[PDB]
Amino acid sequence: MYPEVWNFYKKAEASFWTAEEIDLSSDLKDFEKLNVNEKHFIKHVLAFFAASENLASKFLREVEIIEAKKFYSFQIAVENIHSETYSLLIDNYIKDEKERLNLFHAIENIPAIKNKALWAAKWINDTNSFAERIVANACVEGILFSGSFCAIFWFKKQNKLHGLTFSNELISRDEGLHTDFNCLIYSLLENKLPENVVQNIVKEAVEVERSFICESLPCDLIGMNSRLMSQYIEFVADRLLECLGCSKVFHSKNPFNW
Amino acid sequence: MYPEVWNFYKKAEASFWTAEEIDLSSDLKDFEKLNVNEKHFIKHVLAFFAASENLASKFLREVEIIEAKKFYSFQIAVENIHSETYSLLIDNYIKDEKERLNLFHAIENIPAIKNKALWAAKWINDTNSFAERIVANACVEGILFSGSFCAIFWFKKQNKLHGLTFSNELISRDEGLHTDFNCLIYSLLENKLPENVVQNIVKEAVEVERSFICESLPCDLIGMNSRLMSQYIEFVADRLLECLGCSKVFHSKNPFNW
Numbered sequence: 001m002y003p004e005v006w007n008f009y010k011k012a013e014a015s016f017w018t019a020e021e022i023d024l025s026s027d028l029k030d031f032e033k034l035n036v037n038e039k040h041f042i043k044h045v046l047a048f049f050a051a052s053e054n055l056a057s058k059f060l061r062e063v064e065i066i067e068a069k070k071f072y073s074f075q076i077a078v079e080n081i082h083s084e085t086y087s088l089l090i091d092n093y094i095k096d097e098k099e100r101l102n103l104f105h106a107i108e109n110i111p112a113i114k115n116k117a118l119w120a121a122k123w124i125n126d127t128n129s130f131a132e133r134i135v136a137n138a139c140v141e142g143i144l145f146s147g148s149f150c151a152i153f154w155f156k157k158q159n160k161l162h163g164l165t166f167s168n169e170l171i172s173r174d175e176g177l178h179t180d181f182n183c184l185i186y187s188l189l190e191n192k193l194p195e196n197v198v199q200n201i202v203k204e205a206v207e208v209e210r211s212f213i214c215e216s217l218p219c220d221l222i223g224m225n226s227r228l229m230s231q232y233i234e235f236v237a238d239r240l241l242e243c244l245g246c247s248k249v250f251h252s253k254n255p256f257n258w
Numbered sequence: 259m260y261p262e263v264w265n266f267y268k269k270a271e272a273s274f275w276t277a278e279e280i281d282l283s284s285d286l287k288d289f290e291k292l293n294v295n296e297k298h299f300i301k302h303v304l305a306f307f308a309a310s311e312n313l314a315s316k317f318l319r320e321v322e323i324i325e326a327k328k329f330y331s332f333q334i335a336v337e338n339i340h341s342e343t344y345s346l347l348i349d350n351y352i353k354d355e356k357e358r359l360n361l362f363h364a365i366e367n368i369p370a371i372k373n374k375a376l377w378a379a380k381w382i383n384d385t386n387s388f389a390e391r392i393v394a395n396a397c398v399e400g401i402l403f404s405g406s407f408c409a410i411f412w413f414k415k416q417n418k419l420h421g422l423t424f425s426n427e428l429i430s431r432d433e434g435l436h437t438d439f440n441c442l443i444y445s446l447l448e449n450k451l452p453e454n455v456v457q458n459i460v461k462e463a464v465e466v467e468r469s470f471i472c473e474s475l476p477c478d479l480i481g482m483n484s485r486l487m488s489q490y491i492e493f494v495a496d497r498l499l500e501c502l503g504c505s506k507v508f509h510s511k512n513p514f515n516w
């Protein structure tokens with residue numbers, strides 16, 4: 001078998017959770033005590049998470065190793081559970097349906113999606129190299145939403161938002177596992193990529209990610225600094241290059257120790 | 259939204275379980291207390307379960323309702339857990355690699371496979387009607403293996419095999435849920451089939467199923483009766499037709515109340 005891969009499965013499995021353990025009960029009081037620029041940051045972020053797609057199922061049919069198909073088929077279930085958690089959150093902070101939608105079109109045309117899709121067109125759901133796909137994959141599950149995830153933790157450091165932050169917790173922890181996973185498949189990889197290509201994929205993922213949190217929907221107005229955040233991406237990116245067995249490209253220290 | 263389909267998801271989810279909860283520790287003593295005809299019945303049925311494919315994934319792409327892809331994407335993870343449990347059981351009852359292999363090489367040419375495969379070619383994995391697919395699916399997950407599942411209850415009535423019968427129980431219960439499901443989608447169906455054709459599919463499922471437990475690997479000597487089994491299928495298949503909103507075809511009462 002492939003014993004290190006099986007450890008990721010048993011860890012995802014034994015780490016399984018559902019939307020029932022969340023109980024948004026206790027803080028829309030927090031959200032109405034929040035202020036006016038912070039309110040639509042959240043309303044936009046949650047609506048951004050609910051937009052992105054087929055991915056694991058495309059590697060489910062490619063990766064011909066039972067241990068790994070098992071991890072990916074388990075990925076889609078857990079990822080569906082992240083999806084419901086958001087629909088449930090979008091259900092509570094954005095309670096009445098007028099505004100739900102007034103605000104789903106509102107994203108569609110949000111250059112962060114211009115960037116996110118165009119990138120997905122160039123590297124993912126593509127037709128040249130499998131190697132390229134997992135690298136671009138490990139960015140999707142590593143670099144993308146990295147910014148958004150950190151910005152909900154800025155509410156967790158204020159002891160506000162009730163499982164906006166606790167769900168956020170489980171979801172990023174989860175998405176962390178997926179990331180190390182695509183590293184290991186890279187690590188098992190027949191003919192690895194030249195570091196020159198991997199860094200392009202990565203840089204572009206970074207530039208794509210930043211057009212969310214620093215530009216489209218600026219963290220610089222939940223209390224954060226867009227430039228410090230821009231540095232968090234860099235550091236996330238570098239971490240990821242090391243997990244991919246590559247040398248860094250932005251050498252940048254942890255802007256937040258939290 | 260489709261609230262009845264949501265209920266089957268939340269009942270799958272809330273009914274989730276893993277291979278860790280079985281721990282086969284306590285009865286290969288039973289296995290070796292058993293006799294020759296039962297030994298290889300079991301070694302063959304376990305090997306039969308580990309041979310059949312992609313199914314729900316094919317419906318995951320077709321059925322364009324969130325609540326339902328949710329149920330299907332979770333089906334494939336729980337069906338992976340069924341698989342693993344079987345692999346683990348083949349690992350204990352058939353401990354030495356010698357035979358793991360001379361056994362999937364008996365099986366992989368058994369007349370029940372020629373049956374199983376051919377009927378999968380005529381109805382499933384097909385290019386004519388989606389209605390047919392669900393009916394044929396409801397059979398895959400309703401009539402097929404019903405014989406084999408009942409044969410393992412035979413061993414549960416004798417207070418033997420530790421979770422051969424206990425997993426057997428969680429897997430049947432689970433397959434039970436997936437059958438009920440396919441009923442509901444046919445029940446929400448745009449244009450339902452004429453019962454003339456539904457009965458053909460089921461007949462042929464029935465015949466295919468019987469070629470396993472009453473012919474290829476006869477329950478008739480783990481202690482059971484082949485004919486009585488053959489009527490359990492009919493009864494099972496009758497129940498299915500009611501579940502599918504059709505009249506019966508072999509009106510036959512419960513041969514076993516257990």
Ligand SMILES: [Fe+3]
Pocket residue numbers: 075079141174175178
């Ligand atoms: Fe993920």
Ligand SMILES: [Fe+3]
Pocket residue numbers: 337399432433436
């Ligand atoms: Fe099933």
